[PDB]
Every structure is written in C-alpha cells, then in structure tokens.
Amino acid sequence: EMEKEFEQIDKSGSWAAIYQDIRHEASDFPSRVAKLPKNKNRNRYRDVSPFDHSRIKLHQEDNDYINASLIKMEEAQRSYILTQGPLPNTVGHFWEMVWEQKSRGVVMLNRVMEKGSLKCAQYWPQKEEKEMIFEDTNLKLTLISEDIKSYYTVRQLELENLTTQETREILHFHYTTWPDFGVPESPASFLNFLFKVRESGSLSPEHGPVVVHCSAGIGRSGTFCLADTCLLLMDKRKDPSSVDIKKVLLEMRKFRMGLIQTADQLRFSYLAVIEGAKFIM
Ligand SMILES: COc1ccc(NC(=O)Nc2ccncc2)cc1
C-alpha cells in the first residue's frame, strides 16, 4: 500500500533515490522525426521530443510534425495527448491537432508568463468580440464564455473549420495557481480541478483524447495524467492497493519521455493519489 510506502520514503527522505531509479528504468525510443532540421522551430526545448512510435501526426502533406504524444492506458481505457505549450508559429498546428483528433477538452497547467519569461503563446481569444483566425490551418476560434474561479478558469470556445463550416465546442480548463517554483503545498485544489475535468465529459471515450499541456508537456502534464489513471485503476481493480504508481509512471514513459520532471513532482503525485483515494473510498 502506497500510503505506507509514502511515509517510508518521506521519513527516510529517499525521494531523489526513487526518482533516479525511475529515470534509469525508463524506456528510450527513437525520436528521428523531431530531430529533422526542418522541425527545429516546431520544438520549444531541444531535449524534449516525442517518440516516433507515439507521436501525433497532423493531416497536412507538407509537414505532419507537432511536438505531441498519444498516451494510451489500455487497462484504464484512458487516452491523453500530451504536448508542449504552443509557440507563436505552432498555434495553428495546435488547433489543427485538436480538430483532427476530435478532442473535447484542453487542459492547461501553466500561466503564459512564469518567472518573467513566456512559457506559452496566447493561443485563445481574450474577448468574445475579438475572435482569432489561423490562416495557415483555416480555423476560427471564438471565446463563448469564461468562468474565472480562485484556482482555475473554464472557458467555452467555438472552433470552426473554415473549409467545411463545421463548428465544435471545446472546453479550456486552465489551472492558474501552480506556483512558479516547486509544487502546491496541498493537492486539494488540483484534485478539485481534476474532478471538474472528469465531470465535463472531456476524458470520456465518446470523445477524442484530451489535450494536456504545460510548457514542455512532461512535468505538470505528467502529474495530471498519472493521478487520473491511478485513481481510475483503483475504481476498476478487485484490490485497489495492487495499484503501484511507479509501474504506472513507467508505462506512461513508454509513450513520452521525462513525465514527472522532479522528485518533488513525484512526491506530489503520491499525495494527490493518496488524498484522492479518500474521496473514492
Ligand atoms: C548509489 O546509487 C544508487 C542510488 C539509488 C538507488 N536506489 C534506491 O536508493 N532505492 C530506494 C528505494 C526505497 N527507499 C530508499 C531507496 C541505488 C543506488
């Protein structure tokens, strides 16, 4: 049981040690498409690349590349697209991916500016009457409504394919209170946020996979998926305590490198799952 494993690692302060064991056990697959010179300006960080086998392909003949990975958790019947915060030149690619994959939700776990630097392009409209057109991908995006709470904002967006005049409603879930350094003290507001995404139907198999991002799409994004999948598996299994976070994390790392960036994010993931288990038992 993970609650006892938590106290052990915590009392022994062995978080950096377990984290290193995970780093060394993690899969390594080719990422040849990401490293092509023509894709250099489509990557925010040169050391964060999608594996070729799990990368999302854009349906454009010219260049199909986006820094995005499909995480498929077979036992949990959950699938997530993890991607980097879009760049100024990839905002149109981002919304093309949302369109092509039939996603219903976008989950954003960063602020546009953190530590005085831009972590992400402003890829959604700030006002109802000022819609955005992505000329490169032939899409129009309109803010329909915005509901600002203390810890997160939910926005309803309309995405229109200008080529076919189909429209879809997209839900933007923006967690706004992750601190510049370290992790939240308590996982309560993060769990509340995760349950709000679930309640929307954005994580449901009727829809394409949810798009999850932070700046690189590996750290905070990793914590989001890890907590969701672990809590799901605890509902599904005859023995909820057979769920080993470490094993679940290593499975996800077959699909995208580097998920959970720090020993602090690992500790926070344990705490989120342990605490979330009380609201589920
Ligand atoms: C000398 O380099 C090494 C660094 C780390 C490990 N693994 C390790 O400490 N695992 C561990 C698991 C649970 N509690 C405490 C520790 C082995 C060798």
- CA of 141 relative to ligand 1 center, distance in Å: 49
Final resolution, Å: 1.9
235 lines ligand 1 (CB under 6 A): no
Q: CA 57, 100, 175 angle in degrees (round to 5)?
A: 95
- CA of 182 relative to ligand 1 center, distance in Å: 23
CA distance 161 to 96: 9
Residue 157: Cβ within 10 Å count: 22
The continuous run of DSSP H or E covering 220 comes out as: helix 220-236
Q: Report which of 119, 118, 61, 65 is spatially closest to residue 94, judged by C-alpha positions.
A: 65
Task: List, as own/partner pairs, every contact residues 122-130 make where C-beta atoms lie below 8 angstroms and the sequence separation is at least 24, other chains included.
Answer: 123/86, 123/91, 123/94, 123/95, 124/155, 124/157, 124/172, 125/157
Q: What are phi and psi of 90, to 5 degrees?
A: -115, 10
- How far CA 12 is from CA of 6, 7, 8, 156, in Å, comes to 10, 8, 6, 46
Sheet with 139-148, side-by-side order of all strands: 55-57, 65-73, 78-83, 210-213, 105-108, 167-175, 152-161, 139-148, 132-134
SS3 of the chain: helix, strand, coil, percent, to 5: 35, 25, 40
186 has binding-site annotation = no
218 has binding-site annotation = yes
25 lines ligand 1 (CB under 6 A): no
- CA of 21 relative to ligand 1 center, distance in Å: 7
Q: Using alpha carbons only, how large is the chain's radius of gyration in Å?
A: 19
End-to-end alpha carbon distance in the chain: 14
CB 233 within 8 A of CB 102: no
15 lines ligand 1 (CB under 6 A): no
Strand partners, 156: 145, 171
CA distance 171 to 1: 36
Name the closest-CA residue to atom 15, ligand 1: 14
Name the closest-CA residue to atom 6, ligand 1: 17
Burial (0-12, 13-18, 19+ Cβ within 10 Å), 137: buried
216 has binding-site annotation = yes
220 has binding-site annotation = yes
Q: What are phi and psi of 222, to 5 degrees?
A: -60, -45
Interhelix angle for 2-11 vs 15-25, to 10°?
120
- CA of 211 relative to ligand 1 center, distance in Å: 34
Would you call 214 a catalytic residue per the annotation? Answer: yes
